[PDB]
């Protein structure tokens, strides 16, 4: 009920000539678009990637980004020139733009910039501004970008109008990939611990969607408090993976079960006995 839309741009600048920009677009944790540097056009990665935009609107949109990609390149190269020898190559720039939806006719948009892996600049209201912690030299770049009235107008439109309007289309066009259920499959394994007399039990859980999941080692009705659940890891077919580990005495593996809970099972848990 609370989906975030993220346009993520990655730009690398090796030196005064070499550069690349690739971006990917997400809606929650599903990928909607890809745009490799090596491609003239934006690639859809879902049948519903266009949401409820018409061709003329998409063509037009894709056109302005094409122009942006080239423009953005020359711009950074030129800011470097303005700031050097203060700041110099290699340079990494990342952008995260998009908006978040709320179950009213409600939304908030963001557009954040990182420089060398650090969040430094955002667009806010009608201008770019620096965030707390940013280095003061960025003021010149900002003063400059802010001088460009046409760009600010364009960026306001994108964040205030276009993006929400776009996404609400996507959310309707895309339900049932979004609301899809994929059942987890679980299996058990065991490894020696760095302790000189112990055993680490691992409960692998893979293939489930959406993300929310509950995995716990049980001895009957008893939840084993020492369960360490791992990070959520992606699969290539857009499902998730996760495991949970428990440290055990050698010879206390007796009668333990890993228990899995997920929306997809319809409330018949997976219980796997050792």
């Amino acid at each position, epitope marked *: 009920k609370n989906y975030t839309f993220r346009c993520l741009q990655m730009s690398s600048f090796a030196n005064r000539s070499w550069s690349r920009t690739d971006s990917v677009v997400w809606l929650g944790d599903l990928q909607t678009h890809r745009w490799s540097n090596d491609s003239a056009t934006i690639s859809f990665t879902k049948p519903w990637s266009q949401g409820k935009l018409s061709n003329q609107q998409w063509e037009k949109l894709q056109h302005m980004f094409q122009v942006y990609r080239v423009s953005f390149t020359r711009d950074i190269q030129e800011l470097v020139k*303005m700031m050097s020898p203060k700041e110099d190559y290699p340079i990494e720039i990342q952008l995260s733009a998009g908006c978040e939806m709320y179950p009213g006719n409600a939304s908030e948009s963001f557009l954040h910039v990182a420089f060398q892996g650090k969040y430094v600049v955002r667009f806010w209201g009608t201008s770019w501004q620096t965030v707390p912690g940013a280095p003061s030299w960025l003021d010149l770049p900002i003063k400059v970008l802010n001088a460009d009235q*046409g760009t600010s107008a364009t960026v306001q439109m994108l964040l205030n109008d276009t993006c929400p309007l776009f996404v609400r289309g996507l959310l309707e066009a895309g339900k049932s990939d979004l609301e899809k259920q994929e059942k987890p499959v679980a299996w058990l394994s065991s490894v020696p611990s760095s302790a000189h007399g112990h055993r680490q039990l691992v409960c692998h859980v893979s293939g489930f969607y959406p993300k929310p999941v509950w995995v716990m080692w049980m001895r009957g009705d008893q939840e084993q408090q020492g369960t360490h659940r791992g990070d959520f890891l992606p699969n290539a077919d857009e499902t998730w993976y996760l495991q949970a580990t428990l440290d055990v005495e050698a010879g206390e593996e007796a009668g333990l079960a890993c228990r899995v809970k997920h929306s997809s099972l319809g409330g018949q848990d997976i219980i796997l006995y050792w």
Partner: T-cell receptor
Amino acid sequence: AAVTQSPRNKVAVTGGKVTLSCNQTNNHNNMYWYRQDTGHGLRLIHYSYGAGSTEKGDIPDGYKASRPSQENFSLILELATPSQTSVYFCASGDEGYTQYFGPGTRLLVLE
Amino acid sequence: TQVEQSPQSLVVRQGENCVLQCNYSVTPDNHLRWFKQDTGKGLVSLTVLVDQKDKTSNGRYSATLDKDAKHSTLHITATLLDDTATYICVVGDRGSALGRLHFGAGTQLIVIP
């Protein structure tokens, strides 16, 4: 809000060193050197984003640039050739898109 | 280059109207500026056009911009002798100093007194 150039008019010999100066008191960061030849728009040679900075433009060969200060931007011809006979415009500007142009410098190089 | 002007030159009698065309392929096209240069002298800015379909006036000079057509015109009402000059179309590709100026080769105008 204006820019001066010196000299207005220069007669050099092939293989001479020539310095065309440009001076502005607008406190602009950015100065630009162009040349004008009949049948052509102005073409950028070198430019600058501040004292200490010089940057190649479209046709930099045969020229070096110098920005010793906020105020001053020079174009230097270490070895003049007849092909550098031209009228030379300097300009300056702040963060905005407007560039303010000097009155120009008519230069002639001779054998 | 990326900015074409037309005509290359023209001769008009004092008091007559004339119109000057400019056509370009500069991308992006933030703004377009028209300059008057007298023989010998430097560049005097006449007017700058910024909008998608802009129109500007300044004394006896008026101008239009169509960014779709990437086309501008400069009208002069009731020419005077001092209009004898070269008129230059300039397209700028940013709304800031990060931009480069794209110069037309100009249009020479002679006014017969």
